[PDB]
């Protein structure tokens, strides 16, 4: 619950030396994948990266990628969302696109595979729609017409009935997919678009916004909890990743920031290393102090919180 006193720094344990828009671990934290403007989904072996730097899979795409989400049951399956609006499910062993969902009419910023109903995935787009898909069906299962651009959609980790939707309207819309006529709750507090939403647990939701804050919310009792400050994020998608205790995000200062969920100012930060670069993607290795990070130059680092 309170391990932050153990840590003062992030150590670099590996570096792979354009923009990486997304970096994500597979179901077992064995492989990770990167994707971005270069139209190539690259899969790396985490253990090889730490011990040694060539990807073990490279899948070319039709469009720049905005987001990746690995399937939580089918080890080899990974979804992507791209700038043409296409949501694709890939098999990293065969390299084939298994599904190409094409209903979005503008760039899709986000895709997320459900942890608990692993054939379900959700996407959000500049077309102001949230779409829920099932890997066994070609047509969307659920469509939510919203009023503003959707930057991020994330399933609750304990139930596929709930999604958090981060909107350009500055709010987080929390839906029960069993009745989409109204969200369960809409969380106001951010002053700019909500670029990411991520759950620490079934009841704890975090968000990032281009108001240079992260925020923590209680989705059991629909309460604001805490606002986190220190990083610079006024313009770009700079990444958000959370686990049971920690939030990490990028910064337009080319720094990674780590917050403990109980403390509003950073536990630590790391300068990536003249130029205006930004951190563009982050991903914890589950509840451990290890994290993947990447920036707008395409550099990837494996970092670990340390004393």
């Amino acid at each position: 619950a309170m391990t932050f006193t153990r840590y003062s720094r992030l150590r670099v344990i590996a570096e792979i030396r354009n923009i990486v828009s997304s970096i994500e671990f597979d179901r077992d934290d064995e492989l990770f994948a990167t994707a971005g403007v270069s139209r190539c989904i690259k899969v790396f072996d985490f253990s090889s990266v730490v011990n040694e730097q060539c990807p073990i899979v490279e899948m070319s795409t039709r469009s720049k990628l905005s987001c990746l989400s690995w399937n939580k049951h089918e080890k080899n399956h990974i979804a992507s969302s791209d700038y043409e609006g296409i949501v694709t499910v890939w098999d990293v062993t065969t390299r084939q696109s298994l599904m190409e969902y094409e209903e979005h009419e503008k760039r899709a910023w986000s895709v997320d595979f459900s942890r608990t109903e692993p054939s379900m995935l959700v996407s959000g787009s500049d077309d102001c729609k949230v779409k829920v898909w099932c890997t066994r069906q070609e047509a969307s299962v659920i469509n939510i017409d919203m009023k503003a651009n959707i930057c991020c959609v994330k399933y609750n980790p304990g139930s596929s009935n709930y999604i958090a939707v981060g909107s350009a309207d500055h709010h987080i819309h929390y839906y029960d997919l069993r009745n989409i006529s109204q969200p369960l709750h809409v969380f106001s507090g951010h002053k700019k678009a909500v670029s990411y939403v991520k759950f620490l647990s079934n009841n704890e939701l975090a968000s990032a916004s281009t108001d240079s804050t992260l925020r923590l919310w209680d989705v059991k009792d629909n309460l604001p909890v805490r606002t986190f400050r220190g990083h610079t994020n006024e313009k770009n998608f700079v990444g958000l990743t959370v686990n049971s205790e920690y939030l990490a995000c990028g910064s337009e200062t080319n720094e990674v920031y780590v917050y403990h969920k109980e403390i509003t100012r950073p536990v630590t930060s790391h300068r990536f290393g003249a130029g205006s670069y930004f951190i563009s993607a982050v991903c914890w290795k589950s509840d451990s102090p290890t994290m993947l990070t990447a920036n707008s130059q395409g550099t990837i680092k494996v970092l670990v919180l340390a004393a």
């Binding site: 923009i19 828009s21 403007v37 720049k64 700038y83 500049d126 009023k147 503003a148 651009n149 930057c151 909107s167 350009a168 309207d169 700019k192 678009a193 670029s195 281009t210 313009k235 770009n236 998608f237 930004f278 563009s280 707008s296």
Partner: peptide, 11 residues
């Protein structure tokens, strides 16, 4: 610019 977050200010 490609990773700029959208801004919305309509109805």
């Amino acid at each position: 610019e490609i990773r700029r977050v959208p801004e919305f200010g309509g109805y």
